[PDB]
Amino acid sequence: QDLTVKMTDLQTGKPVGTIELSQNKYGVVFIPELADLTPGMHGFHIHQNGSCASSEKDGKVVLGGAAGGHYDPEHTNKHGFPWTDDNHKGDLPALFVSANGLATNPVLAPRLTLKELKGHAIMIHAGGDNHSDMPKALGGGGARVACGVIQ
Amino acid sequence: QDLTVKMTDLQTGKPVGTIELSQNKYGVVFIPELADLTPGMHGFHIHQNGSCASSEKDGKVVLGGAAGGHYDPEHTNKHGFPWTDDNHKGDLPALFVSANGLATNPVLAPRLTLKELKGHAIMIHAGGDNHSDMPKALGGGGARVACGVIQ
Numbered sequence: 001q002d003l004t005v006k007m008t009d010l011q012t013g014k015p016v017g018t019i020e021l022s023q024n025k026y027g028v029v030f031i032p033e034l035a036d037l038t039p040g041m042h043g044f045h046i047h048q049n050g051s052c053a054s055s056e057k058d059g060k061v062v063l064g065g066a067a068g069g070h071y072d073p074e075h076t077n078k079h080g081f082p083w084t085d086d087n088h089k090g091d092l093p094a095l096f097v098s099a100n101g102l103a104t105n106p107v108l109a110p111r112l113t114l115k116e117l118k119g120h121a122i123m124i125h126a127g128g129d130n131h132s133d134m135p136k137a138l139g140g141g142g143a144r145v146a147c148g149v150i151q
Numbered sequence: 152q153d154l155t156v157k158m159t160d161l162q163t164g165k166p167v168g169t170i171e172l173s174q175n176k177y178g179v180v181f182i183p184e185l186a187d188l189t190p191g192m193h194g195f196h197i198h199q200n201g202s203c204a205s206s207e208k209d210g211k212v213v214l215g216g217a218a219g220g221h222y223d224p225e226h227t228n229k230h231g232f233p234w235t236d237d238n239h240k241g242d243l244p245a246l247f248v249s250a251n252g253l254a255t256n257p258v259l260a261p262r263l264t265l266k267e268l269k270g271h272a273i274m275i276h277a278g279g280d281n282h283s284d285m286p287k288a289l290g291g292g293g294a295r296v297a298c299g300v301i302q
């Protein structure tokens with residue numbers, strides 16, 4: 001009842017490590033083993049489609065655009081906190097990256113279940129996550145930089 | 152090009168003063184002359200319907216419920232700041248009430264026009280306004296306490 005997700009750099013195409021998924025009494029824990037990322041905090045969310053391929057938007061290329069928007073099984077249409085109910089179900093706590101480009105700090109998402117995650121995609125963004133649609137939509141994550149399909 | 156709005160206490164039914172509306176180069180200015188309110192900051196917004204009568208919700212009475220929800224001519228379905236574009240058009244800066252129950256501090260709403268306000272309703276809430284739907288919907292304003300129809 002724990003899954004391994006391989007993460008890939010959307011820009012370089014090379015592997016970036018993995019994230020272990022575990023179920024617990026208080027929700028789902030995400031334990032990262034990543035490297036080759038930019039120090040700081042990164043928006044981190046479960047996206048809708050089981051894909052990390054690109055998509056297209058207004059004549060331009062959208063890296064990782066195939067995974068669609070944030071996981072939102074209740075159709076809230078809003079972006080928020082991991083412990084608030086009226087916003088995407090796939091909104092997770094932000095992912096911290098060390099000075100050396102490494103990510104190893106685990107996070108908890110109390111509202112999710114391991115079972116429902118299968119076939120979805122995990123995304124890491126360039127930007128941070130303010131857990132609001134203001135002043136920048138979707139918490140200011142911006143571009144997608146790393147992706148992996150939950151098998 | 153300036154209108155007077157008479158405000159009424161939803162709980163007592165008695166007049167509470169008025170708010171003057173003026174148009175300027177930077178938006179609409181609301182200048183209050185009120186009294187008989189509770190000290191602090193109060194959620195303040197333009198609501199949809201030209202009414203301050205009650206409505207009904209799940210067997211219970213909703214004071215001022217007839218004015219409907221926040222003015223939202225772009226159908227955003229989100230609550231926010233007065234200077235952010237993707238949320239209700241009728242979201243205004245919060246109204247401060249002095250220790251003596253008086254409200255006299257003017258506020259600016261840059262996104263609105265005096266012309267479009269006619270037939271709408273101005274609402275004062277019990278609660279404050281955090282300019283988010285989290286952690287409480289509609290900024291935590293809660294109950295409606297004072298209302299007036301823009302004529």
Ligand SMILES: [Cu+2]
Binds near residue numbers: 044045046047
């Ligand atoms: Cu995302």
Ligand SMILES: [Cu+2]
Binds near residue numbers: 194196292
């Ligand atoms: Cu209101």
Ligand SMILES: [Zn+2]
Binds near residue numbers: 045079087
């Ligand atoms: Zn989201």
Ligand SMILES: [Zn+2]
Binds near residue numbers: 221230242
């Ligand atoms: Zn609003």
